[PDB]
Amino acid sequence: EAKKGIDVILLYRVLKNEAKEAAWKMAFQTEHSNGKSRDADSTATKDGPIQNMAAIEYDFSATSIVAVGDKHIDELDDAFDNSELVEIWEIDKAEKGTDKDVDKYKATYFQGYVSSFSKTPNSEDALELEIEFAINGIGQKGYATLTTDQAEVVSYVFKDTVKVEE
Amino acid sequence: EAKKGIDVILLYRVLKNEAKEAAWKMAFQTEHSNGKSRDADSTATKDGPIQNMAAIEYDFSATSIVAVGDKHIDELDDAFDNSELVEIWEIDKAEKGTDKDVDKYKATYFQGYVSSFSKTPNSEDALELEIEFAINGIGQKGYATLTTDQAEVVSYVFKDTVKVEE
Amino acid sequence: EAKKGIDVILLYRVLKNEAKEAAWKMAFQTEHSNGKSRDADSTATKDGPIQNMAAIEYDFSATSIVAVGDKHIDELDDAFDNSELVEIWEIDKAEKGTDKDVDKYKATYFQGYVSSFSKTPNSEDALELEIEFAINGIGQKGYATLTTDQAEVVSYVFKDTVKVEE
Amino acid sequence: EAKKGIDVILLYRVLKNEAKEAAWKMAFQTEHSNGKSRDADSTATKDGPIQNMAAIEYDFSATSIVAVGDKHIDELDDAFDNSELVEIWEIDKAEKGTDKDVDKYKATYFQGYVSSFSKTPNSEDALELEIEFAINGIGQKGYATLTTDQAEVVSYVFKDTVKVEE
Amino acid sequence: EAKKGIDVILLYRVLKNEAKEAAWKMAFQTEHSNGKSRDADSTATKDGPIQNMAAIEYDFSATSIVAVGDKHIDELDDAFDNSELVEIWEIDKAEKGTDKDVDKYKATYFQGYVSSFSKTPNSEDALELEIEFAINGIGQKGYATLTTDQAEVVSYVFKDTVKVEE
Amino acid sequence: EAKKGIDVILLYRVLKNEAKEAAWKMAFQTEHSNGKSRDADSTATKDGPIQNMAAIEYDFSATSIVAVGDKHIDELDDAFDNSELVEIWEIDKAEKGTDKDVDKYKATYFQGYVSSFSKTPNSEDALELEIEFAINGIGQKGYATLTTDQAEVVSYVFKDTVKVEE
Secondary structure, three states: OEOEOOOEEEEEEEHHHOOOOOOEEOOOEEEEEEEEEOOEEEEEEOOEEEEEEOOOEEEEEEEEEOEOOOOHHHHHHHHHHHOOOEEEEEEEEEEEOOHHHOOOEEEEEEEEEEEEEEEOOOOOOEOEEEEEEEEOOOOEEEEEOOOOOOOOOOOOOOOOOOOOOO | OEOEHHHEEEEEEEHHHOOOOOOEEOOOEEEEEEEEEOOEEEEEEOOEEEEEEOOOEEEEEEEEEOEOOOOHHHHHHHHHHHOOOEEEEEEEEEEEOOHHHOOOEEEEEEEEEEEEEEEOOOOOOEOEEEEEEEEOOOOEEEEEOOOOOOOOOOOOOOOOOOOOOO | OEOEHHHEEEEEEEHHHOOOOOOEOOOOEEEEEEEEEOOEEEEOOOOOOEEEEOOOEEEEEEEEEOEOOOOHHHHHHHHHHHOOOEEEEEEEEEEEOOHHHOOOEEEEEEEEEEEEEEEOOOOOOEOEEEEEEEEOOOOEEEEEOOOOOOOOOOOOOOOOOOOOOO | OEOEOOOEEEEEEEHHHOOOOOOEEOOOEEEEEEEEEOOEEEEEEOOEEEEEEOOOEEEEEEEEEOEOOOOHHHHHHHHHHHOOOEEEEEEEEEEEOOHHHOOOEEEEEEEEEEEEEEEOOOOOOEOEEEEEEEEOOOOEEEEEOOOOOOOOOOOOOOOOOOOOOO | OEOEHHHEEEEEEEHHHOOOOOOEEOOOEEEEEEEEEOOEEEEEEOOEEEEEEOOOEEEEEEEEEOEOOOOHHHHHHHHHHHOOOEEEEEEEEEEEOOHHHOOOEEEEEEEEEEEEEEEOOOOOOEOEEEEEEEEOOOOEEEEEOOOOOOOOOOOOOOOOOOOOOO | OEOEHHHEEEEEEEHHHOOOOOOEOOOOEEEEEEEEEOOEEEEOOOOOOEEEEOOOEEEEEEEEEOEOOOOHHHHHHHHHHHOOOEEEEEEEEEEEOOHHHOOOEEEEEEEEEEEEEEEOOOOOOEOEEEEEEEEOOOOEEEEEOOOOOOOOOOOOOOOOOOOOOO
16 A cells, blocks of 8 residues: 555754753644755766766755744754754654564654744734754664654543533 | 734834834734745865854845824834834734743844835725835844733624713 | 725826926826835954945836827827936825815825836737836925816716706 | 727838838737837946936737738748848827828837747647847837728628529 | 648658658647747947847747557657758648649748657656757748648548448 | 557666566556757858757656555665666557567666655655656667566456355
């Protein structure tokens, strides 16, 4: 079968808080764009065309909906205003781990800076936040652990028609 | 829950009138765009890529509907024609203050110049005014006080079927 | 209340005809665009950013529907073909004058050249004329007088079912 | 009342056929664009801005539908392939002449070269021919004579239900 | 009456096969674009503007639907991969020949190279092939002969309700 | 008959795995773009225009839908991150082979690098993967063999209303 887009999520945390705080998940996800590209030029000589390949250039973006009572966005704003490194995780919820690493998910690890921070409030729409990152180097592949509270959704349960007595 | 866009408003006042006049709210708000960005360039050396970050560049805008009998817009036009500094406030109506600063809202403070002032009257639409600012330095985060008259809306009340006797 | 777009009109007259002819209103108005802007560049030094502002640049335009039996458009075309100065007024019909200037309206005064003159006739649409101006200097604010004939519209009156006897 | 776009037509003839052939009208007109513009630059000095106005630049275009059995288009093609001058007339059918020049129409006279000649045949649409001219100098205003056959349309007349006997 | 676009077709053949093969018509035609243009620049001198005209630049294109079992497209691909000259004909089916050249059509003759060859297969649409040519010199006007099989369409005929007995 | 777009498929395999692994078909195909072009410039001399043609430039692309449990995409990503050559085949399912090459299909063979690798997950759409290649030299024409499992589709078969007894 096909793989849905819902199963891919993102995590963040600041570099200097690696000892005090663990990873934290954004409140509301909408979408994100992860795309890498390379530059290919051709040099012509009398023996034939030769191709030299350039360095990897990353294009990263994220979109979310601002929640009320949220403190984490202020952390990202302060990290942008002070040029601090941000850790990014991209985790898949469909591919689980085998043998030695059961109950682990397939993930990639990046470190980069924040380069853009914009939001436009309208008169009839909810706030949307766009963040664009600049990544230092090639991302690495590995397996990561996702907690139970960060993977499951919350919905109401069945209740009877009897009083809710104090 | 989510945060609506109606909870964000703007205030203006001219720098040279800081002693005589307090802050004033524009009549009709439609939307505005607040976005900050940075430019990242890569320099290549034989040891690896190095990233240098540049100064912060701001992108600010405002949109409104002109009211009849309004004097404030003339003040902005005069300030634009004479290159005077304008103070800008962005206040949230959802995040209230704690302990020492109860009944205060989370706000951000700017100072900048006016750079654009345009309006296009049609034959069947109301006048709309678009203003663009140029900000000198990084905005500061703090708590601000909003008066009761500037936060509440006005609507008609219940009336009986009796006369309005003089 | 909101200000409608129908309350803003324009007047024209050529500079060399200031003694013989008074101001005249062009026949059919559709819309116009009045927008002023400035250029803000930043110079970087070791002590901090410095802001320098340049001269004001104007963006003016007009749109109309050509009337039959109209001579005034020929005057504008001849003024364009000979580089003559054209006076432009922008008058508001909603803001009336006080005390000494009762029955006067708020207006602005410009002098500029004609730089564009285009029209495209179709097979099922009426002719539309687009004019663009190049303004010499900053417009001045003042109060202007508008005649009764140029401010009111004309509609048919009630008639009986009796003949129109010669 | 307003002026419709139908009342404006165009005429052509080649310069070297001034004595042998009179003016000829295109078969099917759809639309055309006549627009003139000027370039305005500003030079800054210590005494104030100075404006120098440039030469007039013309923008001309025509659109038509190719008719079957038409020879005139080949004349335009040969004139384009050999760089010959083409005379263009733009005549209004609503403004008639007075006293000395009764039964004459208001017209403008141009001479220019042909610079573009394109057509794109589809599988379900009729052929359309697009021509773009380049005009040598300023057009002149005058009155021109239009023949009766070139101004009136042709429609069927009433016929009885009797035979059409040879 | 008007001229439809279905009456214009194209023919091809390779230059080196002028003795062994005659002209061949492409299987399915959709549309094509034939447009010629010139560049006009103005040089200013103290006596007046002077206009100089440059060489003719051609813009040619073709669109078709690939047929199954077709060998001709491979010939065009081979000619493109080896830089061979291609002959192009554009023939009208509405203008027939007179006196000496009865049963001949009005045509135009070109010789050029192939410069583009692209096709994009989708999941629910038929294949479409787009070819662009680069023409060496001015096309020549003349009369050409079209065979009976290349001008008529094929449709089913009437059949009775009796068997198709062997 | 017309040729549908479903009859064209692609195959991949890495150059360094030519001995251990055979060709493999990627799971879900949507579309792809194969386009080749050349650059034609004209040099002017006193004897006439001369045409010079440059090297062939390729434009290749692919689009697909990511499947769950798929390992092959990781191979392409690793080949991109390490600059390895990738073999590409384009096979037609409508043109079968003759005499000595019965049950073979018409195909083309390319070798190139991976230059782009992007994917954007949404909240209500399936993942789509876009890949762009950079080809070294001109593709070669030949006949290739396609296995039975890679050419046929799979659908359910008829079942009775009796149980599925163990």
